[PDB]
Design a protein around this ligand. Structure first.
Ligand SMILES: NC(=O)C1=CN([C@@H]2O[C@H](COP(=O)(O)OP(=O)(O)OC[C@H]3O[C@@H](n4cnc5c(N)ncnc54)[C@H](OP(=O)(O)O)[C@@H]3O)[C@@H](O)[C@H]2O)C=CC1
Ligand SMILES: NC(=O)C1=CN([C@@H]2O[C@H](COP(=O)(O)OP(=O)(O)OC[C@H]3O[C@@H](n4cnc5c(N)ncnc54)[C@H](OP(=O)(O)O)[C@@H]3O)[C@@H](O)[C@H]2O)C=CC1
Lengths: 274, 274
């Protein structure tokens, strides 16, 4: 476990959300080629059926889908339980689905804000909570798929960028707690630049003109970084960009701030209850 | 308009949320000493009443309170309209209320996550949307009260930190678009370190031991930065901390990314629709 080897996903039990098309579908493909057990989800029954059949073709140990909407928090919680049952456990939770709005100036569409927060952030939280016990018993891993727009802001897309930023605040804090605690569930935040997904290409078409990175490789890098158990994985179309997105200032401040807690109390209140 | 002068708030029409205690109450007092028109809100009717009477005493041009809960998006939208009518307009919207959770390791309390997102983030957005036409006609200003834990993560407090990070993703993008567009409503993100608020002193008591900055001055600095129309205002108990909080990387990458849009198309799509 220093360099990635495809063999590391052999027989591992993996959930992939938003896997009927785009990057998600690609993640399933690569996991199937590695011979992982795979449970795939999104809203479209027929699209997921195709992915499932393709994954068995490619050499998945097993492949199933459960269709539903990630704005229903009850489905999200119950999806994880079914997924565990079909696999007899869970090694990796790949949180990938997303709601995209139109690239537009914000004009007070508060329903876009709410829907984006529901689909892109709250459900990732619900999925993680439902999966935590299985991940803890397998010392497994969570991929939190985000965006450059979750580290930095871009005109158009405020609703989306709010939800992605929220992911960083929540999961980074969680990892930080897991580290002190010492939980042995790893959390990888994936910071992706523009990707040549069909929705993204259509979305950005007359609007944003920077180059797009390929989805097949993107999907691979997500699994690499999650398997290698990294805090962050950057796939952003350049080697110098990630240095400007990982602000060392925050790193230093988080480091400095830890010496400000009284760990004796914190750790013994935790053992008392909660 | 280069150095702050108390005169700049004289007769200005200001909403302050979460203003029955802590920093909010201090904001109302400072605005009253400057002779502003003030509408104050929070859930506690009797605590608000006291603050209003103190504000009139301290020299407010006028002072009123409307009590209600920022979990209720209907109240938030109707509060801004009533506030505007009491004052005949609005020059400054100070978004300060917050729900605090106990400082505890996260153990799957999804309701804390939901409620924090509701009170700390969604309501900020609803208030701003409701206020925007009055703010556009006055070319006014919004203060978005955040935290160091909205730029950086801290163990304990994950749900809170998600909400604060959300505010940065949302409002910073909003400012971006306002500059392009060219709206003339300023948005000041207030990054506060530890403040000697009663709630904060109780909350952190046996747990976090860093020094606390005074709420009276904190409240003043929030209004100076908002009146001076700053993108960001730092009040963090140190002069070098802000350097580590404002990632220059982010600013460079935002500046570079701008030249990546086709603004001709963006601006003409805006002009035809939306
Ligand atoms: N494409 C890019 O340029 C970038 C992508 N990313 C990130 O990568 C991830 C995937 O992006 P991408 O592959 O382009 O997205 P796509 O639009 O290609 O695919 C999104 C997937 O999520 C599913 N989905 C959408 N809405 C819901 C819902 N309400 N409930 C359940 N499932 C849903 C979709 O299926 P269905 O619609 O049938 O439900 C689909 O399977 C996201 O987290 C995104 O933020 C980050 C930066 C850039
Ligand atoms: N205090 C500090 O160490 C730090 C504070 N900040 C920021 O400063 C701001 C003020 O915090 P502070 O003075 O410490 O907090 P306080 O607890 O002192 O004040 C909270 C205010 O918000 C109101 N409020 C809480 N919940 C709701 C609700 N659901 N609906 C409407 N009003 C509500 C409270 O009254 P009621 O419950 O009666 O409604 C009260 O008036 C916050 O945004 C905070 O995040 C940032 C960094 C540090």
């Amino acid at each position: 476990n220093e360099k990635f080897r495809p063999e590391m996903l052999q027989g591992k039990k993996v959930i992939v959300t938003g896997a009927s098309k785009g990057i998600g579908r690609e993640i399933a493909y690569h996991l199937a080629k590695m011979g992982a057990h795979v449970v795939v989800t999104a809203r479209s029954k027929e699209a997921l059926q195709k992915v499932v059949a393709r994954c068995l073709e490619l050499g998945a140990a097993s492949a199933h889908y459960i269709a539903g909407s990630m704005e229903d928090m009850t489905f999200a919680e119950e999806f994880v339980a079914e997924a565990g049952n079909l696999m007899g456990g869970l090694d990796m939770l790949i949180l990938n689905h997303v709601l995209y709005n139109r690239l537009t100036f914000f004009h007070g569409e508060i329903d876009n804000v709410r829907k984006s927060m529901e689909v892109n952030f709250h459900s990732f939280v619900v999925l993680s909570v439902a999966a935590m016990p299985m991940l803890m018993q397998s010392q497994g891993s969570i991929a939190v798929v985000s965006s450059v727009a979750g580290k930095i802001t871009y005109p158009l897309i405020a609703p989306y960028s709010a939800s992605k930023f929220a992911l960083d605040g929540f999961f980074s804090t969680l990892r930080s707690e897991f580290l002190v605690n010492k939980v042995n569930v790893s959390i990888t935040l994936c910071i992706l630049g523009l990707i040549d997904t069909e929705t993204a290409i259509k979305a950005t078409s007359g609007i944003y003109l920077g180059p797009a990175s390929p989805k097949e490789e993107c999907a691979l890098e997500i699994i690499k970084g999650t398997a290698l158990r990294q805090d962050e994985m950057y796939y952003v179309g350049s080697r110098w960009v990630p240095y400007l997105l990982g602000n060392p200032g925050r790193k230093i401040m988080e480091f400095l701030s830890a010496a400000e807690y009284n760990w004796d109390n914190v750790l013994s209140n935790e053992k008392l209850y909660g």
